[PDB]
Design a protein around this nucleic acid. Structure first.
Lengths: 206, 125, 51, 229, 94, 62, 103, 125
RNA sequence: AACGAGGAAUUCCUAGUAAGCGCAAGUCAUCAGCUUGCGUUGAUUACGUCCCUGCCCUUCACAC
């Protein structure tokens, strides 16, 4: 069985590169990473780590601050880019953040052959603290999934930012190391250590 | 201070603690606050139910975990033997009892406790 | 581990003015500041008198 | 037949500062240090020198003794562990001003001179070397938690707490982590100064201990534990 | 809906045109013999075809997929599709 | 091991501390069993929480 | 120090590894498996690094009584690794096993 | 006369005017091929319509887009909105309406900004 | 000599907002030791709670 919808080869008077046509075939992040195979390992984080809608570039110019929970629908990569720009000197520079994330995904694919988006989602799943404390002394409370996603993104970005503040390393490379380590589950990542400390102090006052 | 629901949970723990104690005491044979107030455990819990304002009553009941709902049902069952209390506060018991059952009906039916089945049967009739 | 000594001025006073190695440089700074303080006061009094 | 390191020249250990958070360390927080300044020239308020003034201020003179804080600083910085570059000292003044002590510093021995430094530090917010190449004493921003190593065990010194062997406690503790001891330089009072930060509290001996001796006793155990010698 | 027209060829191909502009949109190729009937349900979702080879194909017109195939014993001569009840009768050669 | 519990109701008028919400959650493994817990972040119905300990019952936090 | 750079991009430095205090004469990528790097040093140990984990070698092969300046990976046998030292011996190792002793 | 349609796209002060006519797949922006639009990082943004509906639809038309005002990003969004609106308008006017519906469905499924202007009008609260 | 992002305390802030960037105008009061407009890039975190701190209000059916 075959169904044919094109009977004439499509040649456009304006030349279009072959990569753009293979992008016609399927939507891929930066035309290099496919969203088809990415899945959130933890069931709870599903519906708050949004990867179902493939996008070409992180820039979307959407409205996500209007309602309480719109941030969930926002693509996770774009939220990572947004969290990447902080500390004032970088405020207002989204194109630089997009470039940094592009480079970082390239680095992640280089060092480990896995799909970089999969590594990003694994890191965001792993660094989410599952139990926290509140001041009364302290007392233990559970954490909502949205707060887990927010704090995971913040911890990864802040750890990567601090690691390369006064080091030869550039933001992209240290962020790549942070994401790879967090997805692995190793202690070496700043975010994993902070998450473990939060859960331990919560367990102490449980 | 303690809020509605929290007061009711405290009252249920006290009154049903003694109701369990006496029944176990009678079964084997075959506290300060209540003595100070000079009220039977049925009245003390029933008294606490009256003080809760109706606007806060439904919100107070939802706060209770299930484990107190089983306590609540036994309290109603204990009140049943006292016909004087029942007809005194019949509308209040009926409204509260139905709201409890409706709210957590799914979790109630799942339980296989045979004693619970007998209590509701007695509370029904 | 390498060891150093702290640098400090005994009987420090923050309200007091930082000691300057050069006397001419210190003295002129005293004279300049008196000019700014004195100039600001004189202008303020003249403006009030004119009003 | 493991081959030797290529270069055997003695090499100075790194100076360990707040910026570096991965390296293993033993941190001492001399809690509730009594260091305050006031005009007579400004002077570090002292328990015995200034009784008349402190009565006017209304704070009780019993808790106005920086000599304890000076004393703990002296013993810690001359301990071999600091000479091994595995120790960094933090001080929390009673008022709530947090001071970072670079391990390199060499505080003057006499208590009189030490008072001279503190007033400058509390007022100039930083102290500079004689050769002017790093900042030795620097004030920094509360809370203490952020500056501490990211993966770190926190403990306090409580007389009522169970007695433990400092050597035994350190070895059983993990490696990549680091240890903070919150010691009360205060003369006398409840051991709740660091309860907000700490997770559990321990005692080094059944017998009561001065702030200085306790710090010396604890740091030495790490030296045996970490083979600092 | 009156938007599409299906043409069944004697060589086994089903061509789908658009009535408004008369432009070809899709071509389905399952039967090898002549297609003797084509029908589409009221919802414009499931499409069914029959051919002299005796097979009845079931298509999803929206997704352009082969839902299933049914072989009858004899060649099929004609088709009538009832849209209200989703039943269609086939006049077999036997 | 960690359990997963889906929120079914966000309780109101609980008198909890600011920023802490009392909720009622039913376990995914057993839909019947329900437990009342304290949640720190923004929480709404039908979202899932990771419970480290499934025994403790929530108490008002003031 | 062993460094890994993006070929054709001299400015960027992906990964920097301090394999040993002695000189590291040989740094060869594994032909079958991309992610693993082998470095032979004058320390006489041919550590087998991994790109993802740069802090500790995945394996450390030893047994060479002199400088190791030659390293080769046998095609079709990813586990096997061959190192030749100035001792005059060509040592073969099995990374699948515990290793550190030539087969 | 040659069949032609005109549409506008607007983002902040950036305005794009798109003329779509029967042709041979010649897409231009400011007198240059669409491939040369800058910044390159956002180039795929402008490509988003062309890839969503497939290049075959464009193979029969020429699109000329003139952009003025605003910055880089606003101009990119103006261009993409203008291209999408022009294509849908042309399919409406000179092709079947079913294709128009398919195009609108695809674009609104992906990003409705491609068709509706995004106007962040102030709301006092 | 001074300095390497600035202690304690304290103030402000919820979407084209915070923050960054420049270009114009000087409009009878103010402003150039500057003021006001204009466009460009553009986020994180809350959008619940009355637990704390203040301010405020109360004591024509059916059903309650």
């Amino acid at each position: 069985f075959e169904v044919v919808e094109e009977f004439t080869p499509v040649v456009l008077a304006t030349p279009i590169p072959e990569e753009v046509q293979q992008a016609q075939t399927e939507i891929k992040l930066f035309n290099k990473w496919s969203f088809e195979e990415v899945e959130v390992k933890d069931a709870s984080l599903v519906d708050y780590v949004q990867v179902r809608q493939p996008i070409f570039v992180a820039h979307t110019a959407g409205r996500y601050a209007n309602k309480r929970f719109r941030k969930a629908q926002c693509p996770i990569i774009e939220r990572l880019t947004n969290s990447l720009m902080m500390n004032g000197r970088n405020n207002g520079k989204k194109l630089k953040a997009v470039r940094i994330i592009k480079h970082t995904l390239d680095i992640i694919n280089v060092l480990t052959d896995q799909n970089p988006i999969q590594v990003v989602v694994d890191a965001i799943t792993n660094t989410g603290p599952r139990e926290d404390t509140t001041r009364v002394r302290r007392q233990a409370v559970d954490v909502s999934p949205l707060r887990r996603v927010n704090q995971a993104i913040a911890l990864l970005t802040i750890g990567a930012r601090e690691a390369a503040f006064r080091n030869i390393k550039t933001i992209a490379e240290t962020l790549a190391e942070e994401l790879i380590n967090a997805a692995k589950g190793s202690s070496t990542s700043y975010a994993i250590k902070k998450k473990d400390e939060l859960e331990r102090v919560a367990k102490s006052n449980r | 201070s303690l809020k509605a629901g929290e007061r009711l949970m405290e009252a249920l723990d006290l009154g049903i603690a003694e109701i369990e104690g006496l029944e176990a005491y009678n079964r084997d044979m075959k506290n300060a606050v209540l003595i100070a107030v000079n009220k039977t455990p049925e009245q003390y819990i029933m008294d606490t139910l009256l003080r809760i304002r109706m606007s806060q009553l439904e919100d107070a009941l939802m706060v209770m975990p299930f484990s107190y709902v089983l306590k609540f049902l036994k309290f109603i069952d204990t009140v049943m033997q006292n016909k004087t209390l029942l007809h005194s506060h019949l509308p209040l018991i009926c409204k509260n009892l139905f709201f409890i059952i409706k709210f957590n009906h799914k979790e109630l039916v799942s339980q296989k406790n045979e004693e619970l089945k007998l209590q509701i049967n007695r509370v029904k009739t | 581990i390498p060891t150093h000594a702290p640098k400090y001025e005994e009987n420090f006073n923050p309200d007091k003015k930082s000691y300057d190695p050069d006397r001419t440089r210190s003295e002129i700074n005293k004279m300049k500041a008196q000019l700014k303080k004195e100039r600001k006061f004189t202008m303020k009094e003249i403006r009030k008198d004119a009003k | 037949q493991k081959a030797l390191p290529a270069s055997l020249v003695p090499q100075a250990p790194p100076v360990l500062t707040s910026k570096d958070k991965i390296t293993k360390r033993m941190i001492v927080v001399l809690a509730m240090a009594s260091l305050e300044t006031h005009k007579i020239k400004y002077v570090l308020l002292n328990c015995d020198d200034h009784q008349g003034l402190l009565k006017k201020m209304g704070r009780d003179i019993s808790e106005a003794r920086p000599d304890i804080t000076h004393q703990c600083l002296l013993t810690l910085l001359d301990s071999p562990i600091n000479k091994a570059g595995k120790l960094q000292v933090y001080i929390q003044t009673s008022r709530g001003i947090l001071i970072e002590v670079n391990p390199t510093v060499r505080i003057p021995r006499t208590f009189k001179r030490f008072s001279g430094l503190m007033v400058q530090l509390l007022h100039k917010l930083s102290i500079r070397s004689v050769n002017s190449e790093e900042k030795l004493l620097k004030v920094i921003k509360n809370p203490i938690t952020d500056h501490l190593p990211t993966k770190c065990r926190k403990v306090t010194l409580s007389f009522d707490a169970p007695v433990i062997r400092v050597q035994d406690y350190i070895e059983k503790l993990d490696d990549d982590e680091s240890i903070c001891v919150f010691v009360g330089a205060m003369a006398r009072g409840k051991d709740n100064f660091a309860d907000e930060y700490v997770d559990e509290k321990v005692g080094l001996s059944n017998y009561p201990l001065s702030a200085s001796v306790a710090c010396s006793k604890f740091c030495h155990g790490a030296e045996d534990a970490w083979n600092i010698l | 809906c009156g938007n599409f027209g299906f043409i069944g060829s004697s060589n086994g191909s089903i061509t789908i045109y658009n009535m408004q502009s008369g432009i070809l949109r899709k071509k389905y190729k399952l039967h090898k013999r002549a297609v003797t009937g084509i029908s589409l349900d009221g919802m414009n979702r499931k499409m069914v075809s029959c051919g002299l080879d005796g097979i009845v194909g079931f298509y999803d017109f929206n997704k352009s997929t082969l839902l299933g195939k049914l072989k009858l014993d004899a060649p099929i001569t004609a088709m009538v599709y009832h849209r209200s009840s989703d039943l269609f009768a086939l006049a077999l050669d036997d | 091991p960690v359990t997963l519990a889906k929120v079914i109701k966000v309780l109101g008028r609980t008198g909890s501390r600011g920023g802490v919400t009392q909720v009622r959650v039913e376990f995914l493994e057993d839909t019947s069993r329900t437990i009342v817990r304290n949640v720190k972040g923004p929480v709404r119905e039908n979202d899932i929480l990771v419970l480290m300990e499934s025994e403790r019952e929530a108490r008002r936090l003031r | 120090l062993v460094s890994v750079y993006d070929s054709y991009n001299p400015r960027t430095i992906l990964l920097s590894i301090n394999a040993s205090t002695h000189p590291t004469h040989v740094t060869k990528f594994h032909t079958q498996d991309n992610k693993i790097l082998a470095t032979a040093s004058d320390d006489r140990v041919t550590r087998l690094w991994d790109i993802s984990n740069a802090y500790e070698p995945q394996l450390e092969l030893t047994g060479a009584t002199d400088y190791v300046r030659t390293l080769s990976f046998i095609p079709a046998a990813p586990h096997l690794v061959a190192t030749g030292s100035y001792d005059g011996l060509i040592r073969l190792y099995d990374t699948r096993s515990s290793g550190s002793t030539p087969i | 006369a040659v069949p032609s349609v005109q549409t506008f796209g607007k983002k902040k002060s950036a305005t794009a005017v798109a003329h779509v006519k029967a042709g041979k797949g010649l897409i231009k922006v400011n007198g240059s091929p669409i491939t040369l639009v800058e910044p390159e990082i956002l180039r795929f943004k402008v490509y988003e319509p062309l890839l969503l509906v497939g290049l075959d639809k464009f193979s029969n038309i020429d699109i000329r887009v003139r952009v003025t005002g605003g910055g880089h990003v606003s101009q990119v969004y103006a261009i993409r909105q203008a291209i999408a609106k022009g294509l849908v308008a042309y399919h409406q006017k000179y092709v079947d309406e079913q294709s128009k519906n398919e195009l609108k469905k695809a674009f609104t499924s992906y990003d409705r900004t491609l068709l509706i202007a995004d106007s962040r009008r102030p709301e006092p609260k």
